[PDB]
Design a protein around this ligand. Sequence first.
Ligand code: GDP
Length: 486
Amino acid sequence: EAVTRAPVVTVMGHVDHGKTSLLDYIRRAKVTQHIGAYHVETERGMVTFLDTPGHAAFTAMRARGAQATDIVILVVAADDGVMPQTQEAVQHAKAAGVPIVVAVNKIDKPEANPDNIKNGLAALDVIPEEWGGDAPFVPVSAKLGTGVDELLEAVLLQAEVLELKATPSAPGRGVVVESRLDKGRGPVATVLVQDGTLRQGDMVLVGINYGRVRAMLDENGKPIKEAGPSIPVEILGLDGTPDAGDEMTVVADEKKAREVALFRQGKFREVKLARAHAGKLENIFENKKTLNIVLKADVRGSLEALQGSLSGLGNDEVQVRVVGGGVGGITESDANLALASNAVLFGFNVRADAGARKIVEAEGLDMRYYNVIYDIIEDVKKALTGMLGSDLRENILGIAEVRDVFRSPKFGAIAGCMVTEGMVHRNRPIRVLRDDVVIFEGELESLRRFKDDVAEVRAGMECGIGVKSYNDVKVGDKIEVFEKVE
Ligand SMILES: Nc1nc2c(ncn2[C@@H]2O[C@H](COP(=O)(O)OP(=O)(O)O)[C@@H](O)[C@H]2O)c(=O)[nH]1
């Protein structure tokens, strides 16, 4: 007993390219409210969609050890194709080998030629199915509606090539898409069943949480008694809100459920400490392994130069291959990608965000900032040969956030600020960063509070700061102060 269950499609692409519009058009044109997933049936078969644009949540639920997605559809606007963020989607979908279907969206415009997309995307191992072929190219239009049926046909044709094996008789097993709390009904989950069946009444374990399905809502808001092999449902009964990547399984009784939950929490507690020591760049050589890196530069040119330089490294003892690469700060999505791929973070003139910081703290993965290009490559080659491993170089002691700017016309750029980390003192170099990208690098000019010139400010104390031979310090910047460790 075995049948083809369903394909699961995730929509990814650049911002403002039509992900939400394409996602909504199929839902509103095939047959309110949203739960996190839905499904539509065609003549050849039925396919399910996760109504959440990807490249962010696609990896978030993958780093926990679950792969609900088996088809990824890229959307690129005909007008202006392939943005420095479609490449990020390509790398995210290539880290976990999944079929990709490309669908140009904005073809209902004068300047909407698709051939520049076809050959520009061709140099990404996404060559079209007319010259070589590993991915189709169907033109759709979310607003007008043309070409969608061909898109569904292409998705189904790509899917039928894969395994598509499931048994709609075994005890249910699946993954949770999203969870939410409500004063009525308490905690609510949006589990996606993958194999078996989830008839109402079963004893359900989801990660740490456990319970039973006292109520079940379908995707359209109507209660149902049974769940298919790949039909998303919304269950009630768990004792706490689950995460977005846990596994839902059917067990026998509550005692076994509690034993498994305690074992799972113990294992999760134990796993975290291993990455905090075995995941560092100084321990990769010790214990091929194809060392992976994630790079976040500040300017595209430096990123291209660094990728070109890091090309010819690694012959027989460990190899190097970048799995990321983008312009901007270290987004939490990049940290999730590195965690799922067991890579290491490299930050060129960029700082991690709050979410990136908390993900780094939880996963305990290596994360280092670098100032000059050649230090990155020298550290990479030194770690490849595995000779030395220590911090040094620089250590940030004190970060201050500007509040307001009152630059006086008497050749001054005095900016008010409040210290949010560490302490700031006079005779150290400073570093002004806006939008997590550094803009200036130099010393100070004045750090008085009102007129005292304290030359040392404790954390949490408002003061005024002055940058030497620099201006245009807007509101919302940060000043970090560091030491060139010798
Ligand atoms: N002319 C045209 N415009 C489109 C089409 N699809 C989307 N758009 C435009 O895209 C905008 C919506 O962008 P949206 O999908 O929300 O961005 P996203 O969520 O980041 O993918 C709308 O204002 C539409 O004008 C299309 O097929 N034709």
